[PDB]
Amino acid sequence: PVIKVRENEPFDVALRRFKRSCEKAGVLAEVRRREFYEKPTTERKRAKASAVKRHAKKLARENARRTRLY
Amino acid sequence: MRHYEIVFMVHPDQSEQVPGMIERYTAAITGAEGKIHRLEDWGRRQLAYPINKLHKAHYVLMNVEAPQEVIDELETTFRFNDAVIRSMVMRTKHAVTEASPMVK
Amino acid sequence: FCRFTAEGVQEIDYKDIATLKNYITESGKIVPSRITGTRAKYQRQLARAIKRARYLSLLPYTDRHQ
Amino acid sequence: ESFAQLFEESLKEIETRPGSIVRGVVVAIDKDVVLVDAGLKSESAIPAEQFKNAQGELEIQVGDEVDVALDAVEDGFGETLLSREKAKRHEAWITLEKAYEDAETVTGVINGKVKGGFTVELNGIRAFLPGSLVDVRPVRDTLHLEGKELEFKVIKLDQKRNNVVVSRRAVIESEDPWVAIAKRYPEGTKLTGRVTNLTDYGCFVEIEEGVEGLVHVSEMDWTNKNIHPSKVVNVGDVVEVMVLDIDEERRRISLGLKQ
Amino acid sequence: RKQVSDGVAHIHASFNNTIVTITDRQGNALGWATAGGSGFRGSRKSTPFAAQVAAERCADAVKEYGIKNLEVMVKGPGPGRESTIRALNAAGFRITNITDVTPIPHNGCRPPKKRRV
Amino acid sequence: SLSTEATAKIVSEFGRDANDTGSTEVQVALLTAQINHLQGHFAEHKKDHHSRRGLLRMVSQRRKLLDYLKRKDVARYTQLIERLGLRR
RNA sequence: CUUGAGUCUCGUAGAGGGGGGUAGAAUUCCAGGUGUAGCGGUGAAAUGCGUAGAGAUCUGGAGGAAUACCGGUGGCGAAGGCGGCCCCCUGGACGAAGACUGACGCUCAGGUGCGAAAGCGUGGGGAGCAAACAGGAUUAGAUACCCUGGUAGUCCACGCCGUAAACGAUGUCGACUUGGAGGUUGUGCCCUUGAGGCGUGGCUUCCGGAGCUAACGCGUUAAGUCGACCGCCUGGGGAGUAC
């Protein structure tokens, strides 16, 4: 996330840009992930579980949507 | 026999020595009835990251249909030769005679 | 919306650095096939090419390193 | 018999997929929903806003015929994509007509450049063009009487992404998105883009030849968090948006709307 | 002491404590300050405010060097990350570059085990 | 795997028509050659278990073929086993 | 005899296996520079490391281990499992047409092999992590959870061990029975007029019909409808223990 302040650019704006860049990188997230050792099994489980959740969100909810709430 | 594709990188202070080296390499290939389908001196080039403390290096591409013994020999030569920093002998299916996109 | 299907390329080239550069991050990382919309078969090839390039110092492993 | 088989291939022959054949007769009007029947499986729920012309009031009663569009079938129940896009093809045909005699003539009136090219509006629609196209020379329509009447002489069109810059006054004078993503780049180039779907965090305005923009929720207005983008703008509407940010790598052009 | 116009601010932002170190462009440290040093302990020093004040302190310390331009290198995850740089800006250096320099391995060493809480 | 040319040669020798290829005897020969080739490999690479599985399978197949030959036509089988030098 | 089974031709994708090289990031240590009082850690602390100059920061070196991004209810493998890049040796799968062989097949008690992790033996290696151990907390106690350290081990070679919720808790092989939405990998035709259109094969994720089921659920990858062979069960404990 290397950044250079442009000529006649505000500080705040620059900071914001930097933040955005960082977010894009996913650096903080990566750091968080590597704080502690995740057993392979655990890693697998999370990934599959997450996937399942995503699938549920996509399809079941869509089905629900077809019918009106009131 | 087997169509290899070689790219080796020479140290930029030895850039005037490069042609001779290339010739030598070619000669060896020829020796075992090996063809050399393309050969492209890319020249001095800025490295994406400084390998062995230096920022530029001299890239040579070379495509060869040769037996594997000769390839092995070439590799050995590269490894011991201190002028050549990196090499990357790399198999290929066909002869691929047409020029590279960075030459064009 | 894959590029390589439309172009109809047989194999992605590590030497074709410019092309690679579209699929690499500002931070050097290889861009996901969700974002680029690259076909799966091609994506792997592209990745491989990028890796090769990195070995040859044609592409950088990362933005920071020097 | 084969009467029906022949009738089927006949009816295949006498329809096409896009909004091309002006076939749907308006068979019920109620504010705010028009509805047609172009020989499809169901009737369209048409907005009223694809059919009022240039000052706000409706133009077509019962029996009237506009084609709509297609290639999308069944979201649960119903049939179409809107006929207003239909209209775009007609506009494209008129723009194309230029090529024949190397001069399309209508009226073009362009007061100012959102992103470096005066805006030209033809009939109901208004389009944005690159900065040169508005004036033949360095004349500049800022000194001209505001929203002046000329025509449009075309300067530049982008051929994939739809941006057309046209020539006001001077009657006498006569893979693919992502490599060179530096055209609308530089900091704040305003664009005219139709929104597609508002994902409760976003709005997804994306027009410029196969890209994706967001204008997510933070700008959108001059209130931050309580906004809910469906209330505040639209669905399917061409708006004020500019880039504010491009990553050509993780294809996320992050546009804005608070400007 | 020799005055220097341009330098780097290294911001080591941990979860527990922020450390700001102003150095010349070559690497040689001029001054430093910490949230733990600024009179904050435990709960307090792991905060943005603490980080900011550390930064301020650091800035104060490198007054004699007469530093106008400054590039910032931000390391680690923490509260003292945005705040610290803001503080620095306030203190009145022209911030030139804002770099992130978190050490991300490319899967190298095994991290320590996960805490059971 | 066995090189194309080698395979062709094998086919020509053992096969009656030379276009045949699927003759039991021919198949056996092909198997046998492959086995022979792989012996060298496996002397070197004793822990290559996965590869060895394939070899084992091939051997089994060959054995089966031999058995089949035996019940059908004994003389031919005998000839084959003389040619290849298969103890059984 | 050719429909099962196999052989040949040309391609295809692949973390399939074995061997040998190499690359970059990061941690640790060593040497040196800059620099000055804290660092570290937690819920909060303390042990611990620090003015014998730590932490921070820059330069150079050593060494080991693992391979960010790609990366996906993606792929390959009989299962166990397999993930940077390159080369060498090597097994399987699938498709396209043909050509050939002509039931050569399926299953399998004993038997033989492969078989995570930990563990064992001998010889190497040892960065990080960490059973044991030590100290600091917490607590009524704390032979734990948390913290600071930390040795076997993890890594390599060659042997042994032969077990795991070794799971889809679902033996293998074959046939037959409504559908939808995908993923992946071929391949035939079609104006590829464009990212497409119409098929046809392989493997695969989810939902659901008939039917089945104690229900939960399974549902063309069956737990449906059948056939072939094998393995196994007969109340709970005692016990997968004793001899």
UniProtKB/Swiss-Prot annotation, chain B:
Molecular-function annotations in GO: mRNA 5'-UTR binding; small ribosomal subunit rRNA binding; structural constituent of ribosome
GO biological process annotation, one example: cytoplasmic translation
Top-level taxonomic group: Bacteria
PTM entry text: 5 different forms of the protein, varying only in the number of C-terminal glutamate residues, were isolated. The sequence shown is form bS6-6, which is the longest. The first two Glu are encoded by the rpsF gene, the other Glu are added post-translationally by the RimK enzyme.
PTM sites of type N6-acetyllysine: 93
Keyword annotations from UniProtKB, A to Z: Acetylation, Ribonucleoprotein, Ribosomal protein, RNA-binding, rRNA-binding
GO cellular component: cytoplasm; cytosol; cytosolic small ribosomal subunit
Transmembrane segments: none
Function: Binds together with bS18 to 16S ribosomal RNA.
Family per record: Belongs to the bacterial ribosomal protein bS6 family.
The protein's assembly and partners: Part of the 30S ribosomal subunit. Interacts weakly with uL2 in one of the 3.5 A resolved structures.
Name of the protein in its database record: Small ribosomal subunit protein bS6
Gene designation: rpsF
Span of the entire protein shown here: 1 to 104 of 135
Swiss-Prot record, chain E:
Alphabetized Pfam families for the sequence: Ribosomal_S11
Sections of the chain in a coiled coil: none
PROSITE patterns per record: RIBOSOMAL_S11
Gene Ontology biological-process annotations: cytoplasmic translation; translation
UniProt xrefs under SUPFAM superfamilies: Translational machinery components
Protein family per UniProt: Belongs to the universal ribosomal protein uS11 family.
Name of the protein: Small ribosomal subunit protein uS11
Organism: Escherichia coli (strain K12)
Source species taxonomy: Bacteria, Pseudomonadati, Pseudomonadota, Gammaproteobacteria, Enterobacterales
Gene responsible for this protein: rpsK
